[PDB]
Amino acid sequence: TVERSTRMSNPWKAFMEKYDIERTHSSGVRVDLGEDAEVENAKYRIPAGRCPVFGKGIVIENSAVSFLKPVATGDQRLKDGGFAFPNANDHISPMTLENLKARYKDNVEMMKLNDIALCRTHAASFVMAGDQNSNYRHPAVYDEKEKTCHMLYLSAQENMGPRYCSPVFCFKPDKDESFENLVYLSKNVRNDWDKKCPRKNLGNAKFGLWVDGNCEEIPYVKEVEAKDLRECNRIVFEASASDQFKSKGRGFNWANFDSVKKKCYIFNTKPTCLINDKNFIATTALSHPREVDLEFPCSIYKDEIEREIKKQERIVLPRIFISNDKESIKCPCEPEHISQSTCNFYVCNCVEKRAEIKENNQVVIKEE
Amino acid sequence: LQVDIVPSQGEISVGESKFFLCQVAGMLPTCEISWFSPNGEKLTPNQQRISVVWNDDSSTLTIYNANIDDAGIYKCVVHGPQCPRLTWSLGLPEATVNVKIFQ
Numbered sequence A: 001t002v003e004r005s006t007r008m009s010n011p012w013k014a015f016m017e018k019y020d021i022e023r024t025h026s027s028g029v030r031v032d033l034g035e036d037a038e039v040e041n042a043k044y045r046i047p048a049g050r051c052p053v054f055g056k057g058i059v060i061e062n063s064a065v066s067f068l069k070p071v072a073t074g075d076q077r078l079k080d081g082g083f084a085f086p087n088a089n090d091h092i093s094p095m096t097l098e099n100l101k102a103r104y105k106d107n108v109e110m111m112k113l114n115d116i117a118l119c120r121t122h123a124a125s126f127v128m129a130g131d132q133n134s135n136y137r138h139p140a141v142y143d144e145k146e147k148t149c150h151m152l153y154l155s156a157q158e159n160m161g162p163r164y165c166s167p168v169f170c171f172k173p174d175k176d177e178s179f180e181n182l183v184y185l186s187k188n189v190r191n192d193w194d195k196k197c198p199r200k201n202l203g204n205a206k207f208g209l210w211v212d213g214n215c216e217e218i219p220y221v222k223e224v225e226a227k228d229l230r231e232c233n234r235i236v237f238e239a240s241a242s243d244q245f246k247s248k249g250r251g252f253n254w255a256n257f258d259s260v261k262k263k264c265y266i267f268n269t270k271p272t273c274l275i276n277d278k279n280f281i282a283t284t285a286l287s288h289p290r291e292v293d294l295e296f297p298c299s300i301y302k303d304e305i306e307r308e309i310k311k312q313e314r315i316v317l318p319r320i321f322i323s324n325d326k327e328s329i330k331c332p333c334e335p336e337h338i339s340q341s342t343c344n345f346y347v348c349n350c351v352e353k354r355a356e357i358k359e360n361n362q363v364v365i366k367e368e
Numbered sequence B: 001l002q003v004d005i006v007p008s009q010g011e012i013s014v015g016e017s018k019f020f021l022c023q024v025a026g027m028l029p030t031c032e033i034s035w036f037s038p039n040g041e042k043l044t045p046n047q048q049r050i051s052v053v054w055n056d057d058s059s060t061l062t063i064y065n066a067n068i069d070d071a072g073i074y075k076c077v078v079h080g081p082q083c084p085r086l087t088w089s090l091g092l093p094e095a096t097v098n099v100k101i102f103q
Helices: A013-019 A097-103 A115-124 A229-239 A300-311
Strands: A002-004 A035-038 A043-046 A057-061 A140-143 A148-151 A170-174 A182-185 A205-210 A222-225 A254-258 A263-267 A273-276 A280-284 A315-317 A355-358 A362-365 B002-006 B009-011 B018-025 B032-036 B050-055 B058-063 B072-079 B094-100
Touching: A013 A273, A097 A115, A097 A148, A115 A140, A115 A148, A115 A182, A170 A229, A205 A254, A205 A280, A229 A254, A229 A263, A229 A280, A300 A315, B002 B072, B002 B094, B018 B032, B018 B072, B018 B094, B032 B058, B058 B072
Parallel strands: A002 A315, B009 B094
Antiparallel strands: A035 A043, A057 A170, A140 A148, A140 A182, A205 A273, A222 A263, A254 A263, A254 A280, A355 A362, B002 B018, B018 B058, B032 B072, B050 B058, B072 B094
16 A cells, blocks of 8 residues: 655755756856847947846956946046946935835835845836937946945956956956955846845755755765865855856856865756755855855655645655655665764665766666 | 947048037936047037037037048047046047048
8 A cells, every 4th residue: 555656756846946047047157248238339248147146246456446436437547446336426326225215115016125126126227318228237236234235337247368467457256255245236136036046055965966866966076175165155156157158057156065174066067956964065156155054954855755645545655765754764674864964864775766867967767 | 338439430532521420328417528639639619610519418520621631530538527437348438530531
C-alpha cells in the first residue's frame, strides 16, 4: 500500500525563482546596459535590469568626489562633481523619502510602493517636454540609510582603458564599505522586488543542484580567496553578468562562501536548491554585501511530503529523499544524518536515482 | 543634454547661402545656446551677413552670401550656470560644423 512516486519534482521551485537571475533580472549585473534607447535620432544604451543591485556604486579613478553628487554645471570643473542629476532646484534630485511620500500623497497607487520602489518610480518618471525620449529614462541610486533618492544624469558605469586612465574621468562599478547602503536601480526594477529579487544572504546554506530527491554539490566552480562574506560578495559581483553585446543576466552571478576555510566558490549555472551547511553562506552579485538570513527553511521537505500524503488505498510518497522527519522519508535502509545540518536532516542514499549531473552542472535524466 | 548640428557638413559655394540648425535634446532649466565663429567670436543676432536666430530650444546659423573668408568650423555650445557641462554620452556640451567654400 506504499510505493515511491515516478514523478521527480523539486520542492525548491518557488523558493529559487528569485535566484534565476537570467529570468528575473534579465540583464547585466556588474555593468547593466540591457536596453537601447534613441533620443531625437541619437542612439544610446541604458540599464534595464529588473532587480535592484544592493551595495553597488561607481568608483572614479583619480578623483575624490562621490559619484552621487551632481554633474559639473556652468563654472564647475568636470573632475569636480559626480554622476547625479543637476541639483539646481533640489526638486528633481536628490529627493528624501519624506519628500517623495509628500509629493505623491494623493497618488494612492504610489503610496503603496516600498521605499526603493517609490524612489525608482520617481526617477524613471521624468521626461522633458519637447523631446523624443523614447524609453530613455534615468536610473537611480537609493540610499537606505540616508533615506535619499538620487537620479543619475550619466547611465555609463565603466569607462576604463589605456586612453581614459593613462597619463581623464575614469570610473568602474565596484562594491566597498561606502556603497553598502546603496541600491542601484534601473528604470525597469520590479516594484515587487521584495518577493521576486534577491537581497539578503542565506546563512547556514550553500547553493546546490537538485538531482531527483536531494540537493547535491555543484561540481564545476571557481575557488577564490575571501577573508569574509563581503569580499565574496565583491568577487562574485566583479565576475557577474556584464554588458560591457547584451548579457541578459548570464554570467558568474552566484557564489558559495565557506566561512570556515574562508573560500569563495563562484559558478555560472542557476541554482535549483539549497544545501544546509552550517559553514557556508549563499550569496549573489545582487545580494547585500553583509545582511545574512540564518533561518533555513527546515520544514520545506516535511511540509511537501505531508501535503501529498494528505491529498491521498495506497500512499504514493514523493521523490523527496531528505527531511527533518526521519520516518517521512520511508527509506528502505537507514537514512544518513548530516552533522553540519542545522535542520538535522536525514538523507536516504540506497535509492535508484532517476537523474544525474554531468558535464557543466547540467542535470539530465538517464532513462525515460 | 545632447546637441547636434543638422546639416552636419556644408558644401557651400561663393555667393550661395546655407543654414545650419543646432538643436539640443534634454534642455535643463538654465541652459542656453550660443554660436561661435572659427575665430572664436560669439555670434549675436546681428543684422549682418553671418547672423544667428533664436528659435525655441534651437538656434539657426544663417550664412548669407558666402565668401572664401567665411570657411572654417563653427561651434554651437550649450552653456549655463546650472546647465550640465557634459553630455549624456560623457561628451562636451557642444557641436561643430565644418563649412567649406568652393569657386
